[PDB]
Write a protein that binds this ligand. Structure first.
Ligand SMILES: CCSc1nc(-c2ccc(OC)c(OC)c2)cc2nccn12
Length: 271
């Protein structure tokens, strides 16, 4: 739909950018207000940094993926500089929040709760035939009520034939990415399941880097021998075995996200 008919388009004047939360190669993210009263996050495109078409494809995906557990598209401004305006998440990134005084005090019970909210969001994505491909604690946001949502849909893709195949050159973070995706560029929902397992280690260690003390080649080398990440300090064995299920050699032997949700809810109500 053209901008003059798109329900998501808003006049730039409705927005007041108050506090810059981040700045990078491709633009800025601000906390702001829509029509004076409603707090929003606003991502801006640095003109010439990258294609505006590529920038806006993120918002177009979000139009197709609406759910309580996913950060919600709020609006777009499709004239330069381009803004993607989204649901504001007051406690920021999960990776950051887990290190603050509040996040530090969380019981294993609340951690397992949050793990299950994240799985619930991914179960939606799974049911809708999408994949995320960038699933990790940096890409989970936390509300003021300590609930969690999936964010950053820039790499997310609709899958018709089960499989998305990236290009020869394309690079992905080694620690978080399923072997098949790193080796062949092939992604499925099961590649997200493997990433969820890594994300679980981030939850339980309060945002520490996976594979403590290992370089990328050491990780690759270890996985090929059949080793998986060493038991994080203070990880319940139950959760550790659930991470192992996510790290199964064959994609198709990895559990579904609805299963993960289910199990984690059981882990939560039992604690
Ligand atoms: C900047 C990454 S995107 C992003 N960050 C925060 C956020 C909230 C509180 C913070 O407190 C430190 C923070 O860190 C800069 C980020 C909130 C938020 N809502 C939607 C996207 N958001």
């Amino acid at each position: 739909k053209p901008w003059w008919e798109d329900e998501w388009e808003v006049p730039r004047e409705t927005l007041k950018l108050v506090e810059r939360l981040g700045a990078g190669q491709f633009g800025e993210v601000w906390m702001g207000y829509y029509n004076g009263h409603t707090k929003v996050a606003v991502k801006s495109l640095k003109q010439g940094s990258m294609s505006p078409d590529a920038f806006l494809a993120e918002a177009n995906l979000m139009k197709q993926l609406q759910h309580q557990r996913l950060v919600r598209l709020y609006a777009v401004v499709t004239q330069e500089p381009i803004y993607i305006i989204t649901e504001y998440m007051e406690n920021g990134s999960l990776v950051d929040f887990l290190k603050t005084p509040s996040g530090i005090k969380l019981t294993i019970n609340k951690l397992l709760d949050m793990a299950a909210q994240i799985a619930e969001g991914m179960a939606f994505i799974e049911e809708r035939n999408y994949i995320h491909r960038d699933l990790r604690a940096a890409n989970i946001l936390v509300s003021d009520t300590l609930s969690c949502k999936i964010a950053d849909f820039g790499l997310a893709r609709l899958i018709e034939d089960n499989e998305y195949t990236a290009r020869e050159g394309a690079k992905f973070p080694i620690k978080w990415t399923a072997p098949e995706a790193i080796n062949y560029g092939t992604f499925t929902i099961k590649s997200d399941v493997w990433s969820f397992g890594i994300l679980l280690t981030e939850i339980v260690t309060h945002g520490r880097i996976p594979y403590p003390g290992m370089t990328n080649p050491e990780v690759i080398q270890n996985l090929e021998r059949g080793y998986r990440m060493v038991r994080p300090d203070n990880c319940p064995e139950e959760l550790y075995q659930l991470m192992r299920l996510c790290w199964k050699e064959r994609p198709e032997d990895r559990p579904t996200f609805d299963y993960l949700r289910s199990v984690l809810e059981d882990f939560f109500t039992a604690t």
